[PDB]
Paper text:
Bacterial β-glucuronidase (GUS) proteins comprise one class of gut microbial enzymes that have been shown to reverse Phase II glucuronidation and, in doing so, cause the GI toxicity of several drugs. Here we present the crystal structures of the L1 GUS enzymes FpGUS, LrGUS, and RgGUS, as well as the NL Bacteroides dorei (BdGUS), and show that LrGUS and RgGUS exhibit unique active site features not previously seen in L1 GUS enzymes.
Lactobacillus rhamnosus was found to be adherent to healthy colon tissue in a patient biopsy obtained at UNC Hospitals (T. Keku, personal communication); thus, we chose to study a GUS from this bacterial species. FpGUS, LrGUS, and RgGUS share a similar core fold with EcGUS, with 1.7 Å root-mean-square deviation (rmsd), 1.7 Å rmsd, and 2.0 Å rmsd, respectively, over 576 Cα equivalent positions. Specifically, LrGUS possesses a patch of negatively charged residues, E450, D451, and D452, which we term the “EDD” motif. These positions are generally occupied by polar or hydrophobic residues in our previously characterized L1 GUS enzymes, such as M453, T454, and S455 at the equivalent positions in FpGUS, for example. Interestingly, the L1 GUS enzymes LrGUS and RgGUS exhibited much lower kcat values (10.0 s−1 and 2.8 s−1, respectively) than the five other L1 GUS enzymes as well as Km values ~10-fold higher than that of EcGUS. LrGUS and RgGUS also demonstrated lower catalytic efficiencies than those of BfGUS and BuGUS, which are mL1 and L2 GUS enzymes, respectively.
Numbering used by the authors:
A (entry chain A), B (entry chain A): 3 to 365, 376 to 602
Write the structure that this text describes.
């Protein structure tokens, strides 16, 4: 109903409820029958935001699957009586029921997009109030991301995902207490055109009343350069400062409700970048010039917060990605905290925004009774993502699956439907795509007509033709690249996963898989291939940093394909890209 | 024809040709047409003994598969004219042709057992002579150990084994220049009986003439305690000092040819231990008392020599195995250098001697036209092994396969034949057995009647039910142990592989697979299981030290299941067994 990010001004308040909540596991499912929805203080303290998994010393807790409970007291100011009061949850992984003062307010499905609860009539204005969250982190084939939940021979419930990353759960992002006007901005949209040194922002504004609307754009020094009235309109910016890759310029948009006579009813402000995105045959055009993508390959994963957003790690990840010459990254495999995009906007990065449609395949999948509810939740999370991130200059494209099983002819109805129901959601109409796994190739894939450009996941030299065989793996990759070229490929091709697990410190001459030298050798190979084909317009290596993963005999304490360690220091492969990427211009191959 | 270890006395000489030979690859197979059999000096220097693989910086050399050539000059003393002259090769992996002064003398199949070439008429007595060895290290399903050789798309030949260890090749063990008498000892045998404080060594002596034979046994201080004449006889030792586990006592045996009147024609001396080995239902009896096996789990693998025997590593491996409380180990997966057994004899360890019958199964095998030649070489290498190691007190049992595919009913003819053709080779008639892989279980194995005791390879908690699932893996292992107990198991059971890859330095609380803590957790689990069943009479963990392996995405620079690092320092699991094994008496479970 509204996913606008909270702001602070005279009409809107926003106060974080971050800190130490109370926490309890509910393996039995008795929490509500036990009166826990009224709040409790007999559990363990738990940080918010943060995944709860890594704070326990026992594996039974770290792996817990089922119903878990967060509880906190908070204060509702007297001054807030009469406004629309909201608890906004930035992410509750994966399922939530919200209670205030013991009263059930709302539920939510999906653990990586924000939701808000209207608590206007459930609080005592001027006193302490209680908020309790009943979360669940089970997996099934009916929810994103896809997986199964099993019971061990000893009764305990355990998750077995269809994806790589670990099942980090809980209150993974901030909780806001909001005060909004009764008549307020709900949504707005931006699209851009260029003409000479002039540009045109084309906006619209969604409201829940009939009061007049007034939009104004100011430059980075605060000077106003365009005004307009009405819920639709066009701002004319003379001699505009365009938003450029690794060279951002952000204008401030200000939406204001109310006619020239009354007290202002609502103010909303955001920062936009004036730039356009077109797929012209086989080029990716930003502001009508061709670009070349270089980057990662990312996860929201840190030692102490787990899946939860941590601003220190994020600014550090960004410091590194600029140092290394990169200009893009894909939010694999789920929407990130909204701060990630604002930094991307300020730093002129291009993001591929991915919905958690991962694990749609087994080691078939589109041939099961789970699709019907799965699809409900899939296209709903697509809608919420595009509604949340629409206005960011830095979002280049939407990714609607990661490694779905496109070999089966039954994937084709489902893709048909997903791609029709998302056709007209993004006002900028940016390209919609998805990643093709190693098994989904020009020869074998059945959904190659759908994407606006191709995103390829290939692992020669790691999952196939490892070691001394790498040369045959390079030859096979060029085989497939020859067949794309033969098939007269007209859309762009971007490599979005490739690489090699590497244990920082393992050295060998000559190399063996898992050493720092082999990783450089593998990345050099992929580079040689990428440079001999013109439809290839981007390299996004997997992965930026070592991230945590389910336990397995192939997981040396998590994934290790990262250019940097989980602590964000470089492996030797860091310096290879630092050399290569800072020498490829932004228009490489044009 | 004779595999006796060389000795030095007035009838027999023995001089090592170890050092730097010349070396060349022969990818083309032109070496003989090019005159290389006459010796060469235009190649690269290569140590002997040692695997050649790890001395090259390029992967193409390290991985080379095909014909390779060793060349050396050596001096034949004038004084040796008239004796039987021999080049004895302790191991040439895997195939050899021997040339002396350009003349082809002999070939050999099998890369882990010694062979001798009679060069009595191919040398110039009193000058320098040339020895050239043409080796090959290809694999096929017709040779032990089993594997395949492939060609890459670029022409290069590459091995793909059916086993784990790396294909270390070349002159992996010493080369001796021998001077033997014209009439000489070829073989001898020992068997033992006990009666009160007295014992009886029952010997026989194989000779290539009719001259009289004279055998005498002396104690550790050099006192003679028994003499006998004739090629068969029985030495009566009063108040014998028995050879005890971790408590050896070795008598010196001296065989002498010639009657009381002539100059001695030949002397041969060896050290034996007076002890007996019986499988009594479900007990393993050494000297009629029950023992409990604890140990490894070994390879001949070191950083600088590769597969080649290195006495420093061997004494260090033995220092550690005594420190840790162990008393046994299995020479997986091939006969070791003969020095390993002499140290075992001096340290009172019990060895399971294994022939390189590994890889008899694919990821079927006994259903192929390769068995006929495979079996030729299999039973021949069995014959050579038992002939070489017969007389060691420390060899407890023979292992005739490692992880053969016993699920197919076609394995049964081949086992039938192998087990009949080895029935009467070991004079002591020690137990013959083999290892059963994870897939070969009480439910599924078709060769359970053959072995004299059962050797089990089980990997719960690693290749199955890893991580948080370990509890279900423990339950499944007890399932199988319950079904053995149900089936009324009458032969002993020994666990001979189990464990977990562990990267020294990886710590986590709670644990994850690959950390030092998880390894201890896994080893504790297996211990709990072993202690609840009486037919279980031994634990040999895999592995003693991290050893090198083929490149693969599951091989973090070789195998890592070792209790010690490849440099022979302890991981945390070292101290767990140091505690446990030094508290289990030698008669645990009796």
């Amino acid at each position: 109903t509204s996913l606008l990010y909270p702001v602070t001004n005279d009409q809107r308040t926003d106060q974080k409820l971050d800190g130490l909540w109370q926490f309890k596991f509910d393996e039995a499912g008795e929490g509500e029958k036990s009166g826990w929805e009224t709040g409790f203080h007999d559990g363990v303290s738990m940080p918010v935001p943060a995944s709860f998994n890594d704070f326990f010393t026992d594996k039974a807790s770290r792996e817990y699957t089922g119903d878990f409970w967060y509880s906190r007291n908070f204060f509702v100011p007297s001054a807030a009586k009469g406004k629309a009061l909201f608890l906004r949850f930035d992410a509750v992984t994966h399922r939530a029921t919200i209670f205030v003062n013991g009263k059930e307010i709302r539920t939510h499905e999906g653990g990586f997009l924000p939701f808000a609860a209207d608590i206007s009539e459930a609080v005592k204005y001027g006193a302490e109030n209680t908020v309790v969250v009943k979360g669940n982190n089970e997996l099934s084939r009916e929810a994103l991301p896809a997986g199964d939940t099993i019971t061990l021979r000893n009764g305990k419930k355990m998750v077995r995902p269809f994806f790589d990353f670990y099942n980090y759960s809980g209150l993974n992002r901030s909780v806001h207490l909001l005060s909004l006007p009764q008549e307020r901005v709900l949504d707005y949209t931006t699209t851009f055109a260029l003409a000479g040194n002039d540009a045109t922002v084309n906006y619209t504004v969604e409201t829940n009343g009939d009061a007049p609307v007034t939009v104004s754009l100011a430059d980075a020094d605060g000077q106003v350069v365009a005004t307009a009235q009405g819920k639709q309109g066009a701002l004319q910016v003379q001699n505009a400062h365009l938003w450029q890759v690794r060279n951002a310029y952000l204008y401030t948009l200000t939406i204001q409700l109310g006619d020239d006579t009354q007290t202002p009813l609502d103010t909303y402000t955001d920062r936009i970048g004036i730039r356009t995105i077109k797929i012209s045959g086989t080029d990716i055009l930003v502001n009508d010039k061709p670009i070349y993508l270089k980057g990662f390959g990312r996860h929201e994963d840190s030692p102490f917060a787990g899946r939860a957003f941590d601003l220190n790690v994020e600014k550090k990840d960004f410091a590194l990605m600029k140092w290394i010459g990169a200009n893009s990254f894909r939010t694999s495999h789920y929407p990130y905290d909204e701060q990630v995009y604002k930094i991307a906007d300020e730093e002129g990065f291009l993001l591929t925004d991915e919905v958690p449609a991962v694990g749609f395949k087994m080691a078939s999948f589109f041939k099961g009774p789970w699709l019907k509810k799965l699809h409900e939740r899939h296209i709903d999370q697509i809608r919420d993502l595009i509604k949340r991130d629409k206005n960011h200059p830095s979002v280049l494209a939407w990714s609607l699956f990661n490694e779905p099983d496109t070999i089966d002819e039954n994937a084709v109805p489902y893709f048909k439907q997903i791609f029709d129901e998302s056709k007209d959601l993004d006002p900028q109409g940016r390209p919609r795509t998805f990643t093709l796994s190693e098994d989904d190739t020009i020869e074998t894939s059945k959904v190659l007509d759908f994407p606006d450009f191709y995103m390829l996941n290939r692992y020669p030299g790691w999952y196939h033709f490892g070691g001394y065989q790498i040369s045959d793996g390079e030859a096979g990759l060029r085989d497939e690249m020859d067949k794309w070229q033969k098939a007269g490929v007209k859309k762009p091709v971007v490599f979005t996963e490739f690489g090699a697990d590497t244990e920082a410190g393992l050295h060998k001459l000559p190399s063996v898989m898992w050493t720092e030298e082999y990783q450089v050798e593998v990345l050099k190979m992929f580079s040689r291939v990428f440079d001999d084909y013109d439809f290839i317009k981007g390299e996004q290596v997997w992965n930026l940093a070592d991230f945590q993963t389910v336990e397995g005999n192939m997981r040396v304490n998590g994934n290790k394909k990262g250019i940097f360690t989980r602590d964000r220091q470089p492996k030797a492969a860091a310096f290879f890209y630092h050399d290569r990427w800072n020498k490829l211009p932004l228009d490489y191959k044009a």
